[PDB]
Write a structure and sequence with these properties.
Leucine-rich Repeat Variant; 24 strands; Trefoil (Acidic Fibroblast Growth Factor, subunit A); Ryanodine receptor 1; alpha+beta; 482 residues; eight-stranded antiparallel beta sheet
Length: 482
């Protein structure tokens, strides 16, 4: 594609010079637990895969000044310079916006729950005389993005040492690189969260707190087919057009969603799942093959692999080894494999997909909090700063996430919303969310009062002690409620 249309998935990219070299950074936010945007390095993708899932936005709308201002009193259209755009985060379903807070004493840029104000609208402007107002925005174009609410530039900040995003009066050139646009119905694209079925049996890692360390891969049947631990994100070795149609033989990384780890071949362990910082191309590159015989684009490309209907052998690219079972059976990489090695893929729906990523971030955050709690116990203090603010917001968000529907609503909708809530509760429960909440409750209850906590933690950290235990108990209730 040459032009950006509405309903396209894009990433906002900028550049920085770090140690005499260009570093490409994408705009990222988690949403839940943390609204603030940050920058995800994408340059070192060959060695360390970037956390791309939270970098994706969709172009919801592109309005003229008159259309925007007029609609504020209350299909795939091309982007034109001078248009105001609405960017919806794919994961959190929140909207990229200019926030009313600041970290510098400029404005913070983050995610907003609702696209209701001026704050979630951004006008696009030409970076040179090569483009003009009312002209189509082209793929590859450098853009200036102006906050409609504050009249400020989407800015890359370099103070101090760290690379950050804010809304500043200084300008920054941005590229809206397309991830995907207009997919063929029923076809596998990159960035899709899915399950790999065998023959029923699906590919997975073990349950939380297993003696596995959650690092081995298995073919497992029964209930695991509906649990988060069997979900994987397909990640092509590219950033632009990463959401393009997946092709036979095309190399890709296979990411485990709840754990954030990468299917890999290792020298000593063989087929395992590996940390991002050890997920280099050779160890971590796989492709789908039509058969076991010998054997780039700037668009969606040709649609090749169908959901459910396509049978795919998985092959490790660098080694040529086939994804197979040892003979719940363990997954291995073998020179020959087995005649029934072919897998079919099934797309994960967004409720489950979102839940799985939510658990990933929740686990990461609460384990960080637990590790900080363990570090100063019992070491009376100058106290390894605790993520208080994020823990609070994470808790508050998860509580609203698990909130039962209002009894005032009708019967038909009530039963439908209940069925979703239970399913959401189930996914978290099966991923060891209860233990996680309990471990925070238990480690905090080691202290009698806030002042007792203040003896080991910060006096300032203690100001939130009661609120956190209260919220943790509240979440516990919300997780258990039927």
């Amino acid at each position: 594609v040459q032009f950006l249309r509405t309903d396209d998935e894009v990433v906002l990219q900028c550049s920085a010079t770090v140690l005499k070299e260009q570093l490409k950074l994408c705009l990222a936010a988690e949403g839940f637990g943390n609204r603030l945007c940050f920058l995800e390095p994408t340059s070192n993708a060959q060695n360390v895969p970037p956390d791309l899932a939270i970098c994706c936005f969709t172009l919801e709308q592109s309005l003229s000044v008159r259309a925007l201002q007029e609609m504020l009193a209350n299909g795939h259209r091309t982007l034109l310079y001078g248009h105001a755009i609405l960017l919806r985060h794919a994961h959190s379903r929140m909207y990229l916006s200019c926030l009313t807070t600041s970290r510098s004493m400029a404005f913070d840029v983050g995610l907003q729950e609702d696209a209701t104000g001026e704050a979630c609208w951004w006008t696009m402007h030409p970076a040179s005389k090569q483009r003009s107002e009312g002209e189509k925005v082209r793929v590859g174009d450098d853009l200036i993005l102006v906050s409609v609410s504050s009249e400020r530039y989407l800015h890359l900040s370099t103070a101090s040492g760290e690379l950050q995003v804010d809304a500043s009066f200084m300008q920054t050139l941005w590229n809206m690189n397309p991830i995907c646009s207009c997919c063929e119905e029923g076809y596998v694209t990159g960035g899709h969260v899915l399950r790999l079925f065998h023959g029923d049996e699906c590919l997975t890692i073990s349950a939380a707190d297993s003696d596995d360390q959650r690092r081995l891969v298995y073919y497992e049947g029964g209930a695991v087919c509906t649990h988060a631990r069997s979900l994987w994100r397909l990640e092509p070795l590219r950033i632009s057009w990463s959401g393009s149609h997946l092709r036979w033989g095309q190399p890709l990384r296979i990411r485990h969603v709840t754990t954030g780890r990468y299917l890999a071949l290792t020298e000593d362990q063989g087929l395992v799942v590996v940390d991002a910082c050890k997920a280099h191309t050779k160890a971590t590159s796989f492709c789908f093959r039509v058969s076991k015989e010998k054997l780039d684009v700037e668009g969606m490309g040709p649609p090749e692999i169908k959901y459910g209907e396509s049978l795919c052998f998985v092959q490790h690219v660098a080694s040529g080894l086939w994804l197979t079972y040892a003979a719940k059976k363990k997954a291995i990489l073998h020179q020959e494999g087995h005649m029934d090695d072919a897998l079919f893929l099934t797309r994960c729906q967004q409720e489950e997909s979102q839940a799985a990523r939510m658990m990933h971030s929740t686990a990461g955050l609460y384990n960080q909090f637990i590790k900080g709690l363990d570090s100063f116990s019992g070491k009376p203090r100058p106290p390894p700063a605790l993520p208080i603010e994020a823990v609070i917001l994470s808790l508050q968000d998860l509580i609203g996430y698990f909130e039962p529907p209002s009894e005032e609503l009708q019967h038909e909708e009530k039963q439908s919303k209940l069925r979703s809530l239970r399913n959401r509760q189930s996914l978290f429960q099966e991923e060891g969310m209860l233990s996680l909440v309990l471990n925070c409750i238990d480690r905090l209850n080691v202290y009698t009062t806030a002042a007792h906590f203040a003896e080991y933690a910060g006096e300032e950290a203690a100001e939130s002690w009661k609120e956190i235990v209260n919220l943790l108990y509240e979440l516990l209730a919300s997780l258990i409620r039927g």
